[PDB]
Design a protein around this nucleic acid. Sequence first.
RNA 1: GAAACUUAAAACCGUGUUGCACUGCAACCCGGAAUUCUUGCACGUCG
Length: 54
Amino acid sequence: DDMAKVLDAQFGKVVKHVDKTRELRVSPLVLKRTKIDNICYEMGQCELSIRRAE
RNA sequence: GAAACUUAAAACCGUGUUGCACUGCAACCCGGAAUUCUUGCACGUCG
């Protein structure tokens, strides 16, 4: 609910976010998922690793 | 003895370069030190 007041300070005349985020307890209201005709997964995920190489 | 100017007239003048030769010159770095650097997701929102 902290994320909804700041999103309604720049938007809000299109879609009311304050009343909708306390009915299904989600913020934001969508999920950026994609498709390559095979598997539906997200947009922008990565797998991270590191090593201390000289 | 008392009485009658060794006087009159006459330029110390005429001619003549304080002139001739001579570098205010020779040698000398406006030079030595100094990062156009510090912070910043081409991103958020979907009847």
